Amino acid sequence: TTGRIVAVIGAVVDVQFDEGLPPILNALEVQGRETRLVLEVAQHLGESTVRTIAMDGTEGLVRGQKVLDSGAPIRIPVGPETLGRIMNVIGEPIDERGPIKTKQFAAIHAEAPEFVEMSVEQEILVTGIKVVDLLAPYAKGGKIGLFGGAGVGKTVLIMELINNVAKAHGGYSVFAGVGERTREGNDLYHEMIESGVINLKDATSKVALVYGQMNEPPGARARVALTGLTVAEYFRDQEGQDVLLFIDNIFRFTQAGSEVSALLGRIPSAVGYQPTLATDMGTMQERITTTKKGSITSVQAIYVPADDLTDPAPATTFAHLDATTVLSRAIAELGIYPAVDPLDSTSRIMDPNIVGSEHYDVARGVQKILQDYKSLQDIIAILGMDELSEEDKLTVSRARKIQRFLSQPFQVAEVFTGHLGKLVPLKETIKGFQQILAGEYDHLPEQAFYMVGPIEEAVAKADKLA
């Protein structure tokens, strides 16, 4: 079918049809352009007109211009031939390596797996990260989320995890760059090449890359997630072997939606967000999941605007995770890295019948001392420690030592910490924390605990401090 461009406002192009009106979600191709310009149908305005969202810049478009009904929604190459490649929202290569020659194609819009399709197995996923493993352990085939205000550690954490987990996976991985920095895509790509995850020689790559960065128009940013998403779906259902899915940053998708929402002509909701915020997030999040057919371990970065965790975007996100790593600027400013808030991060796995009672007891142990310290803080703030009870002073010491012992150098952050990255084994963590709690180190100085791996190193650091 051939419609005509009736109106243009930013990424919202209205196209009129005479004989066949394309259904909602269909991808149209604008005629008379140097490069592909797909328009995704959003709604039927009536009058044989359809309101659509452009998948690329709309400059140059002219009223009256011809539009062609592709006859289907945005479809993209899916299969193993995507592994090691970089692709668009619309599935075109962007790595300058020729066409992605796949047998099948898949449309970005799909329904979420049904209820009967759900899975309930809960296995812990050890990361080697002290705070994570001890207080808010991830879980195989689970949903993980890394909350963080600007420049707090979301990305670094995603890298360290790709490093500590992705690298020794044995299965596939999909990295979806959503609304983030292009340089980052480039940084990862080349790095991936270097470590051999991406092989431009053989067919041995284990990662497929999808990107729709900070330079794309809203519509692109609003769909790349779906794109990356689809790629992963294929490996999950169509092949049966466990996938890994990294997204940086999923907040960008929601932001993108708000960018076009006014244009779509909707009465804004709270904070100027689109009234469809929750549903939008929902029909999308619901596809990022493990099922009886396959497993999807997903780590998503979630940017928090103005550092406000009550912002509708992040706020509505919590409900979709199985484990949440909330990063804090306050902690980061203290020099603690990763800047994870130990009293704000949670995990469904934190259950004695899953991590064991030793693990469950240390964890709650650490939290209770940190909570206690937190309450003392107001007073410490005006009057310092002097007026503190001998008993109280001991919680403060311990807390400040536990607080420090929670930090740790990442390989990925070596350039900044000035220390060699460390990977602590779960039992190592449970232990080192027990002792601290148990007053087995009330003699060592705080500093000894800062930036170290296993407790053993914290003892040594103490000697070196003399």
């Binding site: 909602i24 209820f115 709270a270 469809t276 929750a278 939290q367 209770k368």
Partner: protein, 492 residues
């Protein structure tokens, strides 16, 4: 003369988007009536305008297009109802989602029906035992009562609901039909895997048999999420209207409101305070008023509601949180501070209430916890007022000593809802000062030991307390004997 598509019982889509269809025709539709789309997709007639009908779509609007034929149904929205539903997982419309076959429903019910008036009810008087000491002792819940579970994300709101559903096996596996409690659990905006998790646990506990689970999850259309609570409600009234007893959990009304706000804004109804429709209050009042206790003239049945609300930054004074607090018969407020501190459940005694009072407690429990609430309040104060041992008398030292001991007793793990007599026995011990000399750190351990003793040895005292439902003079004597002696041996 093909007369099947006259504009009186049919209509044609003028435009569609964001789940809102603007149907032309439908000259005879009634407000709130269900229509049908060519695609078998159901809608709901919300705005009857001069030149068009604003239809709310119960599904993916992707299947709808301008021009589609819309057909009346002549029916105001309704759903399956009755015992067939027990042990099954349905969607916001009644359809099964557990892939366990069709529901054997013989009855139906309108989702939106006014709650029974003044005349058809009777004061709440029968307890609704949660199995949680803190709740059952301080913020008692009676049948036909509405008690709100409110707090921040992850404070343990759902858990309160699960323990309560699980605790019901006692009576359900029993003989007496009056004591039985059929449960309904409505998920709203929640996540499919979580719900799947949720129904697993229930199954593992052998609680699904008596539970219905209406699920309207994260990916479900706004209208489904929106309807969900009313649907589940109607299912519960079936029991209520038939001299049976039901318990309904609306987890949570926060996500429903959002759904409402969405559905509403998309219909172009001007946004109100905080962007919500001016009638959000009404959205919840209407619903929760349905939970009720019917008089013997109406079957003596009931409907008890436990709605969930999610605050932000522990702020209960917030508009929605206050809107809902002003409807229900009290609230259970959970704080994360309390939780991290080791107080689990994270119930905030001060801020929580039960507008039913002791009328919803057994005499045994009223006996032990009659004044405890105000006591604990007064304790929290002085506890504060002396965060500097300001030349403290005796009466206050005693106050502090009880306060702390009592607080430890109120603690409680998960999944182990206690029996009423068990509660009484343990509260008894503290309330009577028998523990005033034990070390606070010991209290938890003691309770486990003690409770072991009485359960195993003394089930004669337990069954009497439970049976008589009161604490007779001798029972009160046999008990004093037991605690004091056991305590002594215990502090060896």
């Amino acid at each position: 003369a093909d007369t099947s598509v006259d504009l009186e019982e049919t209509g044609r889509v003028l435009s569609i988007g964001d789940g809102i269809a603007r149907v032309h025709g439908l000259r005879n539709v009634q407000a709130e009536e269900m229509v049908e789309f060519s695609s078998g997709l159901k809608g709901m007639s919300l705005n009857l305008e001069p030149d068009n009908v604003g239809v709310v779509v119960f599904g993916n609007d992707k299947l709808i297009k301008e021009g589609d034929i819309v057909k009346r149904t002549g029916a105001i929205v309704d759903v399956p109802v009755g015992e067939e539903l027990l042990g099954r997982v349905v969607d916001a419309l009644g359809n099964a989602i557990d892939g366990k076959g069709p529901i054997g429903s013989k009855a139906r019910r309108r989702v939106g029906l006014k709650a029974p008036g003044i005349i058809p009810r009777i004061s709440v008087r029968e307890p609704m035992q949660t199995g949680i000491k803190a709740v059952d002792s301080l913020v008692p819940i009676g049948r036909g009562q509405r008690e709100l579970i409110i707090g921040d994300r992850q404070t343990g709101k759902t858990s309160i609901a699960i323990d309560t559903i699980i605790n019901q096996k006692r009576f359900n596996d029993g003989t007496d039909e009056k004591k039985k409690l059929y449960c309904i659990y409505v998920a709203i905006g929640q996540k499919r895997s979580t719900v799947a998790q949720l129904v697993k646990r229930l199954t593992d506990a052998d609680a699904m048999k008596y539970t219905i689970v209406v699920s309207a999850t994260a990916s479900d259309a706004a209208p489904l999420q929106y309807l969900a609570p009313y649907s589940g409600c109607s299912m519960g009234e079936y029991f209520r209207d038939n001299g049976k007893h039901a318990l309904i959990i609306y987890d949570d009304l926060s996500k429903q409101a959002v759904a409402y706000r969405q559905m509403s804004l998309l219909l172009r109804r001007p946004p109100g305070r905080e962007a919500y429709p001016g009638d959000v209050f009404y959205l919840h009042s209407r619903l929760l008023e349905r939970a009720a206790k019917m008089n013997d003239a109406f079957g003596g049945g009931s409907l008890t509601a436990l709605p969930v609300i999610e605050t932000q930054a522990g702020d209960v004074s917030a508009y929605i949180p206050t809107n809902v607090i002003s409807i229900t018969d009290g609230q259970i407020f959970l704080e994360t501070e309390l939780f991290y501190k080791g107080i689990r459940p994270a119930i905030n005694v001060g801020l929580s209430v039960s507008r039913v009072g002791s009328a919803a407690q057994t005499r045994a429990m009223k006996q032990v916890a009659g004044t405890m609430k105000l006591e604990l309040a007064q304790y929290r104060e002085v506890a504060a007022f002396a965060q500097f041992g300001s030349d403290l008398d005796a009466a206050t030292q005693q106050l502090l000593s009880r306060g702390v001991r009592l607080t430890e007793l109120l603690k409680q793990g998960q999944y182990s809802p206690m029996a009423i007599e068990e509660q009484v026995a343990v509260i008894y011990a503290g309330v009577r000062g028998y523990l005033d000399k034990l070390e606070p750190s010991k209290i938890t351990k003691f309770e486990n030991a003690f409770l072991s003793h009485v359960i195993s040895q003394h089930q004669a005292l337990l069954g009497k307390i439970r049976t008589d439902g009161k604490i007779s003079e001798e029972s009160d004597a046999k008990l004093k004997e037991i605690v004091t002696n056991f305590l002594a041996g215990f502090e060896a």
